[PDB]
Design a protein around this ligand. Structure first.
Ligand SMILES: [Zn+2]
Ligand SMILES: [Zn+2]
Lengths: 114, 194, 56, 98, 179, 243, 49, 82
């Protein structure tokens, strides 16, 4: 569902149809460059979204003070230090999931109990 | 450090040559490397022209072929003051820099950016190893233009007016197949053939 | 309030004044008490004008 | 409140030059791909460019304003969660000592 | 007089671009400077990747002498530096838009950009930081006849400057014969 | 004991009182109500200390709750809101991938790019900067030697009045473009529900005006009145003398 | 706030708009020719008592 | 020399404050994190001029404080000495 731009001039290729061989010609509209696409999927909606709970993992989260600290272990490095915080995707509908990130292994892991 | 490099500290420019020259900076906007001294249909005439209706402008080859074929007062006012350098800059960049090939196959239009032209300074090694010392003055960014037979204002307005739920997907290709609004290179080719 | 780490829901952080008027309030609890009282005052100051109009 | 105080503003232009000199990319050659994660820098709202390693600047500016070489009404924030860095030097802010 | 085309043979030249600290830019953009002298020395590794600037003592120690020249960009593309010195002296194309294309000349391309940074260990270095913190009825009758013969729409103001006479005497003469 | 910062007017001790206002020159988003055709808007106030009061209000508006998915941006003195691709071309960005690089930053995410596809389709009309600059925004005054609009006039608008912080001089269009893209990204984050609605009663987004700024307002107004009056009596001393 | 407004901000608000010029060359043709009568008024440093 | 800091209303979204200078500083009266960057000077200096006169203001109801802070400006005493 991503956009492929015309390499010859940076504009996204548009879906247009072979009138006889029946192929997906992503053609440029700016210039005349044409491209054959890979899959018959073109448009895509996703009427229900449920993603974004682990947002903004920067490489140096531990430099902030205001994040709390705990004593669970990273199940890659088993260091007893770690940082946890609430899910990032602030909807009225989200959960109490805690995402633990450890400074040692720089690795994220949750505590789901399904 | 041992002489594993051309250790030539700077030899400054001729001061007498410094006057009556200004050495700006050229910048291109494309992901592919461009060398105009190879790609371009030389001669190259970098001019400062107005760009009003450059689709209907001049091809150099077409111009050569056409030449060959032909041959009360208010008494009261107030100047709200403005800086002389700024006003001169407005006057100079009232037209931008344009360079083309002889064919008009590929054109590039410059414009002025005022970021950090002062802080930049040039150092070129010469053929003898002379390291020349030029304080750069201005930088210009150039974008290619009308490489793909751009449309025009009025039929553009009829396209963007809310008469259709969506404009035609291949409308520009249909107009090209009709034949209207050709490229500058195509106009030059037609003038050369006729 | 800027005296706690992020993402708490323990009642003292979000405003349970556990203490009592005899012992006095820790300053955070004092602030939350001020919040509740202010809410009451502004509600009175609007309801009086509207109820007067609608009595007339 | 009793220790409250009011900012009176200070010219940003030494901070701007200083902050350029300690490593920025001015916006005119910024490109998103080659710096996919570097940090935006704002001064009174105006963006001035992007910088690679933010923490060194952040602590450096702290040390500089603690040494007294920047008028201590100046306030800086490194919002680590969004790769932001703000400098404020306008008048009319409210501040209290700590 | 000369040709109308630009120069091309100096395309294949290496040019290096330097971002410069502003004091050093002011020292190096002086007309009383720029005389071919060599005020410093450069130092690249055999492996590259680090340059200090060995500035000579011509600066007289107000500014440092040890400058960590940091190569900002190793490889640079699509960059061409050009000069412009002044020149010796549907088919209705406008021939003259008063474009005055002077002697334009390429002088090379850019592969590297580097930034000059003074090394903080120098006493003049970081001293600059606190410095930045610190900062006649019958005669006129015939004469009138020539005058309107010169110009039939002769105005009163043009008449007055052509007479320099008493105006009431002037006005009573004019209407007696013509307008 | 009379440590007092007050004034004596006609022999009565008068005092100023600090006013406040929202912080200038700072980004706010909003969620206007459902029955309006607009769902999310962004605002920028501005100032420049403080010639002719420098209001210069800007919006970026969104439409629909689908198919009305469009981003019209208002602007003085342009009487209609404009889809933003026109503005990007007007500042001088032609190719759409680089408009997208101005807007979004992570090329991996896409939801913003499907969210922006209709505005790109709006931008299919115009493929050149002055052919975007031409668009109307009449709102006075009388047009000079024009055909429809001076391209010079429109670019003079975008240079002098538009967004009267980051610059005002002549040559900082790329800065204006990045600023606009940042604004769009903030609006789009708010409407895409990754980032919450802004607040107005956070204290830091307010400033306290006080005696100096208030005196600055009165002094600027009075001195501009004064300059107008001294410009009078100097042109109309056609007769003697230079008093 | 007051001290800031007196020490600075006042000289600034003057010097930002000091110039006012009516330099008269001829403002019509001739006048033969005439010369550029610079009637200029500008403000400098200010004073406070 | 870096002992106190001026903090505006925003860096509190970036810092962490301690009440007492002992509250977490070493690792029948009243009921009363290891990354502190600042400690406040004294918690009683969140008050204002009028409310700094109420004795034991932490030991009553807040609206009563608001009344008293209103009424105190209507009191009489001396006001100056000249
Ligand atoms: Zn193409
Ligand atoms: Zn681990």
């Amino acid at each position: 569902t991503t956009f492929r731009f015309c390499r010859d001039c940076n504009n996204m290729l548009y879906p247009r149809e072979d009138k006889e061989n029946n192929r997906l010609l992503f053609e440029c509209r700016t210039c005349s460059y044409v491209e054959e696409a890979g899959s018959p999927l073109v448009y895509r909606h996703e009427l229900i979204t449920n993603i974004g709970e682990t947002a903004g993992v920067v490489q140096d989260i531990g430099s902030d003070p205001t994040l709390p600290r705990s004593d669970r272990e990273c199940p890659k490095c088993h260091s007893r230090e770690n940082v946890f915080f609430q899910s990032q995707q602030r909807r009225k509908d989200t959960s109490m999931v805690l995402f633990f990130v450890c400074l040692s292994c720089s690795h994220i892991f949750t505590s789901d109990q399904k | 450090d041992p002489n594993e490099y051309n250790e030539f500290p700077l030899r400054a420019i001729p001061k007498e040559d410094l006057e009556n020259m200004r050495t700006h900076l050229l910048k291109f906007q494309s992901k592919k490397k461009i060398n105009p001294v190879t790609d371009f249909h030389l001669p190259v005439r970098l001019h400062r022209k107005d760009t009003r209706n450059l689709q209907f402008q001049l091809t150099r080859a077409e111009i050569v072929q056409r030449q060959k074929e032909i041959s009360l007062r208010r008494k009261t006012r107030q100047l709200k003051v403005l800086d002389e350098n700024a006003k001169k800059l407005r006057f100079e960049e009232f037209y931008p820099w344009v360079m083309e090939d002889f064919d008009g196959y590929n054109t590039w239009v410059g414009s002025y950016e005022a970021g950090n032209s002062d802080s930049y300074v040039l150092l070129s090694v010469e053929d003898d190893g002379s390291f020349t010392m030029i304080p750069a003055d201005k930088v210009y960014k150039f974008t290619a233009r009308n490489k793909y037979a751009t449309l025009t204002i009025d039929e553009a307005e009829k396209r963007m007016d809310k008469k259709s739920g969506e404009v035609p997907r291949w409308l520009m290709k249909h107009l090209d197949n009709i034949g209207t609004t050709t490229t500058r290179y195509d106009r030059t080719r037609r003038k050369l053939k006729a | 309030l800027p005296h706690f780490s992020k993402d708490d829901y323990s009642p003292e952080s979000k405003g349970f004044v556990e203490n009592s008027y005899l012992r006095g309030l820790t300053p955070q609890e004092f602030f939350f008490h001020a919040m509740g009282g202010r809410e009451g005052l502004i509600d009175t100051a609007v309801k009086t004008a509207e109820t007067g109009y609608i009595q007339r | 409140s009793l220790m409250s105080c009011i900012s009176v503003g200070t010219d940003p232009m030494p901070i701007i030059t200083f902050l350029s000199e300690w490593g920025m990319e001015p916006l005119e050659d910024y490109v998103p791909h080659q710096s996919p994660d570097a940090t935006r820098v704002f001064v009174n709202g105006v963006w001035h460019g992007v910088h690679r390693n933010p923490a060194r600047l952040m602590e450096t500016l702290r040390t500089l304003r603690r040494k007294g070489d920047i008028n201590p009404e100046v306030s800086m924030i490194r919002d680590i969660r969004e790769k932001e860095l703000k400098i404020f030097t306008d008048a009319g802010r409210v501040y209290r000592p700590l | 007089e000369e040709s109308l085309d630009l120069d091309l043979e100096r395309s294949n030249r290496q040019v290096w671009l330097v971002r410069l600290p502003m004091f050093l830019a002011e020292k190096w953009r002086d007309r009383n400077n720029l005389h071919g002298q060599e005020l410093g020395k450069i130092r690249i590794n055999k492996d590259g990747s680090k340059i200090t600037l060995l500035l000579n003592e011509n600066d007289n120690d107000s500014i440092p002498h040890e400058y960590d020249l940091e190569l900002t960009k190793k490889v640079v593309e699509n960059e061409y530096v050009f000069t412009e010195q002044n020149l010796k002296k549907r088919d209705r194309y406008i021939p003259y838009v008063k474009t005055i294309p002077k002697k334009t000349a390429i002088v090379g391309t850019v592969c590297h950009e580097c930034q000059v940074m003074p090394s903080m260990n120098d006493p003049n270095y970081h001293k600059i930081v606190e410095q930045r913190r610190n900062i006649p009825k019958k005669e006129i009758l015939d004469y009138l006849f020539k005058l309107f013969d010169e110009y039939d729409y002769w105005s009163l103001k043009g008449l007055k400057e052509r007479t320099r006479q008493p105006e009431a005497h002037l006005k009573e003469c004019l209407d007696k014969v013509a307008t | 004991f009379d440590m007092g910062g007050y004034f004596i007017i006609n022999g009565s001790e008068k005092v100023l009182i600090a006013q406040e206002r929202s912080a200038g020159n700072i980004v706010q988003v909003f969620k206007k109500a459902a029955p309006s055709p607009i769902s999310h808007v962004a605002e920028i106030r501005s100032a420049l200390e403080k010639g002719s009061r420098f209001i210069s209000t800007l919006q970026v508006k969104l439409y629909g709750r689908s198919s009305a998915r469009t981003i019209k941006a208002t602007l003085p003195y342009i009487k209609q809101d404009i889809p933003i691709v026109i503005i990007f071309r007007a500042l001088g960005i032609i190719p759409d991938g680089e408009i997208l690089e101005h807007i979004c930053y992570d090329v991996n995410d896409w939801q913003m790019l499907e969210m922006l596809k209709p505005c790109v389709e709006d931008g299919f009309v115009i493929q050149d900067r002055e052919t975007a600059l031409d668009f109307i925004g009449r709102r006075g005054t009388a047009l000079g030697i024009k055909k429809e609009k001076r391209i010079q006039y429109a670019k003079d608008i975008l240079q002098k009045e538009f967004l009267p912080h980051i610059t005002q001089l002549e040559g900082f269009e790329s800065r204006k473009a990045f600023f606009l893209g940042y604004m769009i990204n903030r609006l789009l984050l708010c409407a895409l529900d990754r980032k919450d609605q802004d607040d107005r009663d956070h204290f830091g987004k307010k400033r306290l005006d006080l005696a100096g700024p208030l005196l600055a307002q009165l002094f600027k107004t009075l001195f501009k009145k004064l300059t107008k009056d001294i410009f009078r009596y100097m042109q109309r001393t056609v007769e003697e003398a230079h008093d | 706030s007051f001290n800031q407004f007196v020490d600075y901000t006042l000289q600034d608000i003057i010097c930002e708009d000091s110039t006012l010029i009516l330099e008269q060359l001829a403002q019509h043709t001739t006048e033969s020719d005439n010369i550029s009568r610079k009637y200029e008024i500008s403000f400098g440093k200010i004073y406070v008592t | 020399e870096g002992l106190v800091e001026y903090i505006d209303a925003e860096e509190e979204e970036s810092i962490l404050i301690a009440m007492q200078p002992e509250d977490l500083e070493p690792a029948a009266k009243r009921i009363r994190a290891t990354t502190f960057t600042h400690c406040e000077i004294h918690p009683s200096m969140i008050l204002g001029v009028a409310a700094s006169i109420i004795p034991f203001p932490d030991h009553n109801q807040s609206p009563r404080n608001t009344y008293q802070s209103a009424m105190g400006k209507q009191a009489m005493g001396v006001f100056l000495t000249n």
